[PDB]
Amino acid sequence: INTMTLDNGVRIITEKMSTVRSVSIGIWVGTGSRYESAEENGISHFLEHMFFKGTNTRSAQEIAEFFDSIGGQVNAFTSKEYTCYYAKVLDDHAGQAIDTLSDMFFHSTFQKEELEKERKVVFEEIKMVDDTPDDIVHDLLSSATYGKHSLGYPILGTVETLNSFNEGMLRHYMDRFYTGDYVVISVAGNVHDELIDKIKETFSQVKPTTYNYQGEKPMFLPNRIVRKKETEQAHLCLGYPGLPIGDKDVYALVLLNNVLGGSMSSRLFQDIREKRGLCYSVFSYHSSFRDSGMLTIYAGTGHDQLDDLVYSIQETTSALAEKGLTEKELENGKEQLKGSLMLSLESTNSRMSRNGKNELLLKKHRSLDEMIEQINAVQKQDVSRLAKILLSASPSISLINANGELPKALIHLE
């Protein structure tokens, strides 16, 4: 996996694979909803949509027609600390793909006509995510956990902010963040130097980063958000403090989440679903940021069973935080992580994505063997000691149901 830093700060990270005939391209920008400010919330995500509305030589439709003629495997996503524009094409079209992706990045034409239009689509996107209780519930959890911090902002923004949005705000923001220190180009697959130099030549145009971004650290609080909505199930989320991206004990958290509810053999899947038959869907995942991080559990059960679910989950998170892991579980976790990782080496997007994300959020490149060592290097008590620190805390809580009132999740009686 080669890496390259141009003079403006832009980084080109590449990985060649002869076994394939395709190639994944990704333009990773180091900004997201976290870097926004009250008034400009959603700007990152709007900009990501607006990047497909048209350039000086390619209109919205022409952009669409191009990517469709090459398979149609192009997508964009905005997270809390990075944004992404990527595509997958056959070797003989990478050049063109880069030209189109490039022109969209640099020469976009934020026409008011097209922008007034796109603002409406994003408004639908918001309502749609709203009509998906099992999805919006995860967003509320971030709001209850961080309150007014930018990490508690919904990535799509609000109807208010969006209405304030215009070409001015877009460019003002794009100018500060879409610069040298924040841009990373990731290419994986059947890449030829030609293409790489094309990328080099093109992304030199990226202006050096001059803006010094000042970021405040977040405070985790066990607050609660509830929403009254007409549903069959009670959608529930519990948040526990996690670790920040850089943290050395990340592999420890990965394994700890795997045991919690990150797999079939996970405590939650077995205790809550397989044995109690309470939830069809119950799982856990972790979110790691620059300064903060957090472990999340999701569960959904029929209303009439909500109180029982909270207790059952409580029991599961206790015997884990208290007693810890077992030797069989620790290794099962490792076999899984190593196994999935090995299996992902067949997907170009998978490598492209991994590479660009680590280079962007770790400023580091981790080889296979290197990542594998880490997994194996994890001792059984590293996880246990971690589960004791993280899973003991008072969790933040998110909930959506019919009566719209919190259940009986304040006392420890059963």
Next chain:
Amino acid sequence: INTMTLDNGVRIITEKMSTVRSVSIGIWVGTGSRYESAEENGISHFLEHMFFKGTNTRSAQEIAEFFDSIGGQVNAFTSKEYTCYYAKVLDDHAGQAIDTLSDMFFHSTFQKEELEKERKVVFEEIKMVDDTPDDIVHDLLSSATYGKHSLGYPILGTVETLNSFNEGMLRHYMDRFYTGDYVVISVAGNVHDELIDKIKETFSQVKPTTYNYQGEKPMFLPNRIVRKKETEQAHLCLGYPGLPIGDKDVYALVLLNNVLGGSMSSRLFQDIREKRGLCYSVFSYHSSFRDSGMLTIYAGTGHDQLDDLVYSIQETTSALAEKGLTEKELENGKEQLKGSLMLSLESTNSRMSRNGKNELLLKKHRSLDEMIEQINAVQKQDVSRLAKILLSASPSISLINANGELPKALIHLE
């Protein structure tokens, strides 16, 4: 693509790839919701779930622990005309994967205790799709279109039906269809001869098909279903006539769907979202069965623009049907399908599911060059013709909105 048959009737379809370590095993069975009868509606799916609830050798938990130790890349699903069980494992564990899958297929005990708790998870699974308006509305459409025929019955079945499923009903069903003529083991990737022998020696045990299923042929009814649900968006589904699985002009249908709402540059995407910004989501897809088939359109918009949205979708489909598609559009589609197909070849789970599904439903296979020719051979004449026949029919409507009443705009449509 080597295809072989055992005496009991089960077919073994395999495909060796040369730049992969993994292997994808898939147990296909030609039965699903279509083959069920009112009273056993949901049995096909509920069965797929019990296959993971334990056998004599290994328990539900040991089953979860095994697949987790090998990437966790396992899964299973049920459709209207087929069920599927698959995994992706590094070759050195492919034998073990087959051993576990066999035990489940043959020696899976449906204990009273497990069958009880698992009935609940499906009750939760059912409520979960219920809370997802953009998902269940598609099923409500299948219902309107096929009235009381099995093609209209939900995959997950009803709650009254599940409430009676006992080990007797399961085995009775299973002992009918899970036989030679319906079984098809598909393998793709780092396929070793040793694994193929282990497969033949195992799936030879399956009993020959004595039962002779005799089914009715569905009939398209331009019916409409409307469910009132407290939502933000009005979710619309419009179905039209399609074509049977192995019909003469399937590829013309694929290309038609592509121009309709099957891609970024489709008439629907460009008219409804790109120019008006009425929906964030607007698309179409074809559903083809062995004797029937339908073309489906989907769109989510705010409760107000439901009238506006309807007239709009109306124009597009109207104009497409009457005026056809341009050669540029037809050529843009072929490039898309061809390129899409190419990029998929890289995936093992992709080749396995394709071969298994083809054998099981079409019985015929085509090399990549044979597939690319079929895509090329399609003429604008063909596609535009089809567009008139299919899109000039009265469509079926499934709608979910705040009031639960049909829109005024839902009238004129000839």
Next chain:
Amino acid sequence: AAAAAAAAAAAAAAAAA
């Protein structure tokens, strides 16, 4: 990623997918 399955447009019917 690459690992492709074989689902439809909208109607859950799997283990946990």
Next chain:
Amino acid sequence: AAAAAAAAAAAAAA
């Protein structure tokens, strides 16, 4: 590693 949160709702199109 990978940073895949929960249910998707920040992609480009449907």
